[PDB]
Design an enzyme around this catalytic site. Structure first.
Site, PDB file in Angstrom:
ATOM      1  N   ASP A  64      19.725  45.058  74.357  1.00 42.18           N
ATOM      2  CA  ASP A  64      18.735  44.449  75.249  1.00 42.18           C
ATOM      3  C   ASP A  64      17.632  45.453  75.542  1.00 42.18           C
ATOM      4  O   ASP A  64      16.729  44.987  76.393  1.00 42.18           O
ATOM      5  CB  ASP A  64      19.518  44.116  76.778  1.00 42.18           C
ATOM      6  CG  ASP A  64      19.898  45.286  77.538  1.00 42.18           C
ATOM      7  OD1 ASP A  64      19.695  46.409  76.950  1.00 42.18           O
ATOM      8  OD2 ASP A  64      20.226  45.164  78.773  1.00 42.18           O
ATOM      9  N   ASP A  95      30.500  48.582  92.931  1.00 38.52           N
ATOM     10  CA  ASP A  95      29.673  47.409  92.919  1.00 38.52           C
ATOM     11  C   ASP A  95      30.328  45.996  92.896  1.00 38.52           C
ATOM     12  O   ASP A  95      29.625  44.992  92.707  1.00 38.52           O
ATOM     13  CB  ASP A  95      28.291  47.626  92.555  1.00 38.52           C
ATOM     14  CG  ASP A  95      28.089  47.100  91.184  1.00 38.52           C
ATOM     15  OD1 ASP A  95      28.814  47.048  90.274  1.00 38.52           O
ATOM     16  OD2 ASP A  95      27.066  46.149  91.096  1.00 38.52           O
ATOM     17  N   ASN A 125      23.567  53.074  82.409  1.00 35.78           N
ATOM     18  CA  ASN A 125      22.734  51.932  81.805  1.00 35.78           C
ATOM     19  C   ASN A 125      21.332  52.159  82.604  1.00 35.78           C
ATOM     20  O   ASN A 125      21.401  51.668  83.823  1.00 35.78           O
ATOM     21  CB  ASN A 125      23.439  50.712  81.683  1.00 35.78           C
ATOM     22  CG  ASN A 125      22.615  49.700  80.822  1.00 35.78           C
ATOM     23  OD1 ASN A 125      21.583  50.046  80.491  1.00 35.78           O
ATOM     24  ND2 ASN A 125      23.232  48.614  80.516  1.00 35.78           N
ATOM     25  N   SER A 180      17.584  48.616  76.797  1.00 38.32           N
ATOM     26  CA  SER A 180      18.200  49.663  77.758  1.00 38.32           C
ATOM     27  C   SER A 180      18.791  50.721  77.049  1.00 38.32           C
ATOM     28  O   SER A 180      19.078  50.596  75.690  1.00 38.32           O
ATOM     29  CB  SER A 180      19.041  49.065  78.907  1.00 38.32           C
ATOM     30  OG  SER A 180      20.024  48.593  78.387  1.00 38.32           O
ATOM     31  N   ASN A 214      20.899  50.075  73.811  1.00 37.08           N
ATOM     32  CA  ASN A 214      21.625  48.929  73.856  1.00 37.08           C
ATOM     33  C   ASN A 214      20.564  47.838  73.120  1.00 37.08           C
ATOM     34  O   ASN A 214      19.639  47.889  73.126  1.00 37.08           O
ATOM     35  CB  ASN A 214      22.124  48.504  75.345  1.00 37.08           C
ATOM     36  CG  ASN A 214      22.864  49.480  76.129  1.00 37.08           C
ATOM     37  OD1 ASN A 214      23.917  49.976  75.649  1.00 37.08           O
ATOM     38  ND2 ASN A 214      22.463  50.019  77.347  1.00 37.08           N
ATOM     39  N   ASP A 244      21.890  53.930  77.598  1.00 37.18           N
ATOM     40  CA  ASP A 244      22.886  54.441  78.209  1.00 37.18           C
ATOM     41  C   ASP A 244      22.998  56.004  78.353  1.00 37.18           C
ATOM     42  O   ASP A 244      22.709  56.615  76.953  1.00 37.18           O
ATOM     43  CB  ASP A 244      24.215  54.116  77.720  1.00 37.18           C
ATOM     44  CG  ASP A 244      24.777  52.483  78.095  1.00 37.18           C
ATOM     45  OD1 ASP A 244      24.269  51.947  78.853  1.00 37.18           O
ATOM     46  OD2 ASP A 244      25.666  52.170  77.579  1.00 37.18           O
ATOM     47  N   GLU A 269      33.288  56.851  76.011  1.00 35.61           N
ATOM     48  CA  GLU A 269      31.867  56.601  76.068  1.00 35.61           C
ATOM     49  C   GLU A 269      31.021  57.657  75.397  1.00 35.61           C
ATOM     50  O   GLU A 269      30.067  57.538  74.868  1.00 35.61           O
ATOM     51  CB  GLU A 269      31.451  56.497  77.549  1.00 35.61           C
ATOM     52  CG  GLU A 269      31.990  55.364  78.455  1.00 35.61           C
ATOM     53  CD  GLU A 269      31.234  53.951  77.928  1.00 35.61           C
ATOM     54  OE1 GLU A 269      30.349  54.123  76.949  1.00 35.61           O
ATOM     55  OE2 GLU A 269      31.876  52.860  78.597  1.00 35.61           O
TER      56      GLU A 269
END
Ligand SMILES: [Cl-]
Ligand SMILES: [Cl-]
Ligand SMILES: [Cl-]
Ligand SMILES: [Cl-]
Ligand SMILES: [Cl-]
Ligand SMILES: [Cl-]
Ligand code: NA
Ligand SMILES: [Ru+3]
EC number: 3.2.1.17
Length: 129
Positions: free
Chosen positions: A48, A101, A59, A50, A46, A52, A35
């Site tokens: 979209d 989650d 994120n 967003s 990203n 990270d 990562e």
């Protein structure tokens, strides 16, 4: 901070990640390698919109607030900049929520594509833990 491999392993252990939700320490080190290359300051935008942040590329759509990700949540209740600190506490605490989650470590696409199913214990080889 660019951690060393065993250094990061040690830090993750102390903070309660080894076998957290059943994921052995090597899994968390391997995820971090791919990562962030063990760099706390890593950021990546990203598609979209967003971003990270940090050693585990957490994120801003769901987990931290960066003020520029419309329609997002902040489920870790933390500014995304707190995830860039030399001290990995915030990143680990937030990772704990992520992995709990529902989909476990598959939430980390690089974990699923590059760590899952591999000999992840290699990542903690030679470390005094
Ligand atoms: Cl391991
Ligand atoms: Cl960035
Ligand atoms: Cl936002
Ligand atoms: Cl904030
Ligand atoms: Cl730390
Ligand atoms: Cl990937
Ligand atoms: Na957010
Ligand atoms: Ru610490």
């Amino acid at each position: 901070k660019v951690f060393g491999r065993c250094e990061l392993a040690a830090a993750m252990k102390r903070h309660g990640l080894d076998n957290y939700r059943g994921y052995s320490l090597g899994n968390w080190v391997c995820a971090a390698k791919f990562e962030s290359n063990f760099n706390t300051q890593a950021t990546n935008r990203n598609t979209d919109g967003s971003t990270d942040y940090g050693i585990l590329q957490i994120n801003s759509r769901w987990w931290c607030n960066d003020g520029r990700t419309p329609g997002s949540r902040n489920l870790c209740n933390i500014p995304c900049s707190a995830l860039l600190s030399s001290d990995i506490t915030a990143s680990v605490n937030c990772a704990k929520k992520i992995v709990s989650d529902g989909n476990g470590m598959n939430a980390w696409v690089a974990w699923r594509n590059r760590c899952k199913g591999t000999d992840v214990q290699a990542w903690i080889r030679g470390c005094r833990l």
